[PDB]
Design a protein around this nucleic acid. Structure first.
Ligand SMILES: [Mg+2]
Ligand SMILES: [Mg+2]
Ligand SMILES: [Mg+2]
Ligand SMILES: [Mg+2]
Ligand SMILES: [Mg+2]
Ligand SMILES: [Mg+2]
Ligand SMILES: [Mg+2]
Ligand SMILES: [Mg+2]
Ligand SMILES: [Mg+2]
Ligand SMILES: [Mg+2]
Ligand SMILES: [Mg+2]
Ligand SMILES: [Mg+2]
Ligand SMILES: [Mg+2]
Ligand SMILES: [Mg+2]
Ligand SMILES: [Mg+2]
Ligand SMILES: [Mg+2]
Ligand SMILES: [Mg+2]
Ligand SMILES: [Mg+2]
Ligand SMILES: [Mg+2]
Ligand SMILES: [Mg+2]
Ligand SMILES: [Mg+2]
Ligand SMILES: [Mg+2]
Lengths: 68, 70
RNA sequence: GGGGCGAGUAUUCGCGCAAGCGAGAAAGUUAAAAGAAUUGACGGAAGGGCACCACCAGGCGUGGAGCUUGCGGCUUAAUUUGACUCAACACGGGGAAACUCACUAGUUUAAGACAAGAGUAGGAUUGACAGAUUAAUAGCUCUUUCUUGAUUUCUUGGAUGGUGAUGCAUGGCCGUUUUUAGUUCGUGAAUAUGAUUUGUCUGGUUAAUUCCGAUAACGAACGAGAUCUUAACCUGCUAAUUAGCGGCGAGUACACGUACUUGCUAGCUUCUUAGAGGAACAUUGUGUGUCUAACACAAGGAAGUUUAAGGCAACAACAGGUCUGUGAUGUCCUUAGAUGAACUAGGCUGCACGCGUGCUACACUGAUAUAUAUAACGAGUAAAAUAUGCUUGCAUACUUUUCCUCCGCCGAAAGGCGUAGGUAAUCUUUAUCAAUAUAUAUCGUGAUGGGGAUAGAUUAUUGCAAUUAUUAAUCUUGAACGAGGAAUGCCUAGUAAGCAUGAUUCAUCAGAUUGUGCUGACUACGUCCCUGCCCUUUGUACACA
């Protein structure tokens, strides 16, 4: 069987999903077989760029407030 | 796939026949006529490496140098 | 009226011309039969949509012949094995002479941890010349009799290895549904039981649950989009080597500057290379549409089907494939006459036949022979091998060589011998490493100078080894085939088709994959008729559907 446990927000496709996500796989030998472990963490909007500089997200268009 | 068919018994392994205190047959000493070598000594091996007295030749068991009797 | 079959059956009585009607059991057997809703799946029910793995208008074919290659079947000592609609069948990177190797016939080996007992220095055990014996130069075994020194050997446990079984015990990875457009949550409402609904929709629009809008719903999240890589534009910016152009001299010939060779080295970036930027938004005009969301045509422009091609890929699944990729792994087998590891030979390729992917053709819009002109993506350097003292072996430089190979000589050719450069924008070698093309001549509708299967003979190279013929070279031989029946595949622009080439495998071998360039069409600008997938209503006694 498989069991999934989620929380929050996660991305799957595109180039951002390879920058902002951290992934690992491990296995544990129990008495009656092998179990696979798979962890995926999206970093808190923290990713330097290929032209290295702290980026944010390719999906946002905040509009600034006029000075008053 | 099938179990073997054994019609011929096993090839036997090589045992080495044992002689008790064979060295006392290599040197013997009388009262007169002191110690006398009974086999003969090698040529390029450190002294005391004796060689076999075969039916028609002499054989060194350590370097395999063969000298033909005639 | 009192769970379902047995059963409105048996027996008996009344009534009837008969058919039959009205009252009406028991033994035995059974865990459910039965009512109404909900979600899905299915329909030879009704509507609506999408798509050259669907069709329409067409191109080129395949299916028919010879042959190359994979799969069944037969055969064999063995012809090792997994996968069988799409989604098995030039797939397992699977082009096997040995090795690989898992199959057939033989023969060796210990590279059997550790613990306990035995055996033993008055010797546990190891190795071997000669003759026999073996395919064998495995002392494998035997005769014979020397060497060796506690490393080993025998017994009982206990480990170890295994291309041995189980993908229906698992991990990981991959394929498919599906490259479609889908999936979920908070609060509110339907509740006044519930499984569950709505939000997620009649309509218009888009490649798209993409948008506009209607509205018991108001808002959010993944997927789509955005993002990333390559291509197309820039005489504007930043640069000049292992890139070019230009500048200055000396020549060789011509015409009164042109072509080529050569020594040297003001400046510049068009050509070559590669970093940063910019550029398209449907801009402007005209039409259709609720004048919204959008669509079509024209002008400009390098570019107006999101400009072209790709990579990534939600929720949920399949008893899909793989334990023959793995010091990923559970269980079961086996472990000295081994199912461990090797060595010799053989098989995987055996041929009355059936099926899939392909290569070569059936000629004149051609075949043969000469000549002219012209690409893009690539790759490249512990062993054996060449030289003194010694009788096919030893000691010797790791001083040369092993990969791509220019050039010179020899040979019809394949190839051989001698010598450069290159660990590479520097050399091979690319202001060019191909073939379709183009020009001129011969042949002349004749299975023909089309086609090139099948056979004979000789010669080279790789390799320890070429027989069942590794590959290549020369002469000879010269089969079917005259456009392919029923069926069926791919495809909309620098695309189909035709034409060749670099890499992967690789000691030697491509009719195979995976990339690259060269020549370059016809037909549509649609539809729901066939096939497939999706949505709505509807029926259901289906839910392994
Ligand atoms: Mg995308
Ligand atoms: Mg009853
Ligand atoms: Mg029922
Ligand atoms: Mg079809
Ligand atoms: Mg048609
Ligand atoms: Mg053809
Ligand atoms: Mg055929
Ligand atoms: Mg095949
Ligand atoms: Mg086969
Ligand atoms: Mg071969
Ligand atoms: Mg294994
Ligand atoms: Mg499976
Ligand atoms: Mg699996
Ligand atoms: Mg719903
Ligand atoms: Mg330039
Ligand atoms: Mg394995
Ligand atoms: Mg073998
Ligand atoms: Mg085969
Ligand atoms: Mg002929
Ligand atoms: Mg011919
Ligand atoms: Mg292949
Ligand atoms: Mg249809």
């Amino acid at each position: 069987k498989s069991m999934k446990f989620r929380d929050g927000y996660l991305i799957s496709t595109g180039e951002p999903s390879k920058r902002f996500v951290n992934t690992a796989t491990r296995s544990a030998q129990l008495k009656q077989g092998v179990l696979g472990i798979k962890v995926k963490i999206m970093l808190p909007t923290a990713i330097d760029t290929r032209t290295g500089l702290t980026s944010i997200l390719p999906d946002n268009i905040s509009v600034l407030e006029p000075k008053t | 796939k099938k179990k073997k068919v054994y019609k011929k018994p096993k090839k036997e392994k090589h045992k080495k026949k044992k002689v008790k205190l064979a060295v006392l047959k290599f040197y013997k000493v009388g009262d007169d006529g002191k110690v006398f070598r009974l086999k003969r000594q090698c040529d390029n091996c450190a002294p005391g490496t004796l060689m076999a007295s075969h039916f028609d030749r002499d054989y060194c068991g350590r370097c395999h140098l063969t000298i033909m009797k005639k």
